[PDB]
Enzyme design. Structure first.
Site, mmCIF file in Angstrom:
data_model
loop_
_atom_site.group_PDB
_atom_site.id
_atom_site.type_symbol
_atom_site.label_atom_id
_atom_site.label_comp_id
_atom_site.label_asym_id
_atom_site.label_seq_id
_atom_site.Cartn_x
_atom_site.Cartn_y
_atom_site.Cartn_z
ATOM 1 N N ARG A 1 -24.474 -8.657 -135.628
ATOM 2 C CA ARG A 1 -25.828 -8.109 -135.760
ATOM 3 C C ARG A 1 -26.532 -8.167 -134.423
ATOM 4 O O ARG A 1 -26.398 -9.142 -133.683
ATOM 5 C CB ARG A 1 -26.644 -8.926 -136.767
ATOM 6 C CG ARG A 1 -26.262 -8.685 -138.225
ATOM 7 C CD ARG A 1 -27.158 -9.462 -139.165
ATOM 8 N NE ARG A 1 -26.875 -9.154 -140.567
ATOM 9 C CZ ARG A 1 -25.906 -9.731 -141.269
ATOM 10 N NH1 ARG A 1 -25.124 -10.640 -140.698
ATOM 11 N NH2 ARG A 1 -25.712 -9.398 -142.543
ATOM 12 N N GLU B 1 -19.435 -20.333 -124.991
ATOM 13 C CA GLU B 1 -18.532 -21.029 -124.068
ATOM 14 C C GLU B 1 -19.185 -22.278 -123.469
ATOM 15 O O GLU B 1 -18.502 -23.282 -123.249
ATOM 16 C CB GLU B 1 -17.971 -20.084 -122.987
ATOM 17 C CG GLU B 1 -16.840 -20.725 -122.198
ATOM 18 C CD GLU B 1 -15.772 -19.753 -121.689
ATOM 19 O OE1 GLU B 1 -15.609 -18.618 -122.224
ATOM 20 O OE2 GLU B 1 -15.075 -20.173 -120.755
ATOM 21 N N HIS C 1 -9.053 -27.294 -133.955
ATOM 22 C CA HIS C 1 -7.886 -28.081 -133.557
ATOM 23 C C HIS C 1 -8.096 -28.715 -132.196
ATOM 24 O O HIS C 1 -8.393 -28.025 -131.219
ATOM 25 C CB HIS C 1 -6.617 -27.208 -133.570
ATOM 26 C CG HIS C 1 -5.401 -27.883 -133.019
ATOM 27 N ND1 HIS C 1 -4.889 -29.059 -133.538
ATOM 28 C CD2 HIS C 1 -4.583 -27.547 -131.989
ATOM 29 C CE1 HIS C 1 -3.813 -29.408 -132.854
ATOM 30 N NE2 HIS C 1 -3.610 -28.516 -131.908
ATOM 31 N N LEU C 2 -7.941 -30.038 -132.126
ATOM 32 C CA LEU C 2 -7.960 -30.719 -130.844
ATOM 33 C C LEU C 2 -6.568 -31.240 -130.539
ATOM 34 O O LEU C 2 -6.201 -32.325 -131.003
ATOM 35 C CB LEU C 2 -8.934 -31.893 -130.882
ATOM 36 C CG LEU C 2 -10.392 -31.548 -131.176
ATOM 37 C CD1 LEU C 2 -11.222 -32.800 -131.018
ATOM 38 C CD2 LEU C 2 -10.892 -30.462 -130.240
ATOM 39 N N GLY C 3 -5.793 -30.468 -129.790
ATOM 40 C CA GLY C 3 -4.433 -30.837 -129.454
ATOM 41 C C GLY C 3 -4.441 -31.619 -128.161
ATOM 42 O O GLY C 3 -5.510 -31.893 -127.602
ATOM 43 N N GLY D 1 -12.158 -23.197 -119.882
ATOM 44 C CA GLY D 1 -11.901 -22.120 -120.825
ATOM 45 C C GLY D 1 -10.565 -21.459 -120.553
ATOM 46 O O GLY D 1 -10.228 -21.156 -119.405
ATOM 47 N N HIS E 1 -19.296 -9.301 -132.470
ATOM 48 C CA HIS E 1 -20.728 -9.080 -132.482
ATOM 49 C C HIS E 1 -21.107 -8.436 -133.821
ATOM 50 O O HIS E 1 -20.722 -7.303 -134.113
ATOM 51 C CB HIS E 1 -21.127 -8.202 -131.280
ATOM 52 C CG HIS E 1 -20.680 -8.752 -129.959
ATOM 53 N ND1 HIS E 1 -21.040 -10.013 -129.515
ATOM 54 C CD2 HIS E 1 -19.914 -8.217 -128.981
ATOM 55 C CE1 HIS E 1 -20.509 -10.224 -128.327
ATOM 56 N NE2 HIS E 1 -19.817 -9.155 -127.976
#
Lengths: 139, 139, 139, 139
Positions: free
Chosen positions: D92, D63, D107-109, D83, D90
């Protein structure tokens, strides 16, 4: 309480004509001040190739239900709602009967809605849990 | 490379008889050493009530594809695979044509498989991205 | 009732020594027959660079809480539990005070556990909702 | 190419002062036209109580990385990014060394961004895969 448009089950069911919800036999069943309920048959229409309810079909039910719930919560003269993100845990398999989903609101924001959707088979044991994020978009 | 059973597209398509994949027109289209591809029509069978591809239908395609991929990766005489968790971002709406999904492996463990599934409409622009976790279960 | 090992808050807290939970000030606060509760400060330890609670920090709290809940539900002489899948919706930003998480079971299977984790700031309004899937692994 | 603001690793690192990223030793390491890379130590700061990298710590890294990537892609004079939804598998466990995350855009909207984030330990084997949805919010 939750709703802007009072849900009318007849109307909800009729709006599905010529869409996947109709094809899969999704039926809006009940509502109250805090929830909306729909069910779907578990048969050849919704099976995966080994005779279990297809996990994606559970998600079709969840997203049909949650999308409809969002529709009932917004000013439809200014906004429409589309699914943005969905996730689900598959808890138990189902082979027959119906699967019933109940939707409850987590958050109804100005730009997003988040719905908690719980699915179970006729034995009443949890079969799937989904969470659905809807985007609220200006017309 | 990835596969235990070499995929046979005819066979994959035929296994869907009397299941949702058949009903929705899901078609296994192609494969290579690292991926498996299937498509689905965007029409009244897969629409939601406003004429867009139902987000759940995208997930039906993703889970059909990923489940089949898992099936091709395990010793089917000892194991079967069921979906455990699925999630998806809905990126762009689709109204017509077909939506095509490509599955690639993230991790094939002894007890779980994780698949990366990318969907796009006929214009080739990403429409949906899904990630699917399958449980690997002893027969 | 949910629990195999009766929760003891001192041990839960003490067990975090030399791990991230201690670093971030996670405090196990409460439990009952169906739930386990922990809180975390919203401060420089848990902020992102713009002074809001880091969304990942919300997930650390959720995963700490749910993982501990799983540990209290398995036979620890034969099994241990690890995170398998986690997801969260970030509902409201927080800048100060504490964030409180409550975990409830959705499903405790033989090989996976699914936890519902609800977070809120000191105003009591939902700030994050998480769902956690744990794997149950033989020692 | 992806970027609006050209990444400058010193500023990215410096900007984490008095926030969780600094506390955990997150280091922005590399970038190119399509990706941004950061790593984090696997030690007492990021362990869960059994000495494995805490799954939430993997999510903090993901994040941090994706949120910074969004900041480098928007017009920061009019917008900021938070966020909205995050999920991770997860894959390993890790006990020592560092975990490295690479972010790529899905995607960048205009109102949401979706990032694909891949993590691996020093052995190079996939350890976690995350997907992050950011909201783009007017200041």
């Amino acid at each position: 309480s939750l709703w802007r448009q009072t849900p009318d089950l007849e109307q909800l069911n009729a709006s599905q004509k010529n869409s996947i919800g109709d094809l899969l036999g999704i039926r809006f069943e009940a509502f109250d001040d805090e929830s909306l309920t729909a069910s779907m048959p578990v048969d050849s229409r919704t099976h995966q190739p080994f005779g279990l309810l297809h996990g994606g079909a559970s998600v079709v039910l969840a997203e049909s239900l949650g999308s409809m719930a969002s529709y009932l919560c917004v000013d439809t003269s200014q906004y429409y709602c589309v699914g943005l993100e969905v996730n689900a845990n598959h808890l138990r398999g189902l082979r027959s009967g119906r699967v019933t989903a109940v939707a409850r609101a987590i958050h109804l924001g100005r730009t997003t809605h988040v719905w908690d959707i719980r699915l179970s088979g006729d034995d009443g044991k949890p079969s799937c849990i989904a969470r659905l994020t809807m985007a609220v978009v200006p017309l």
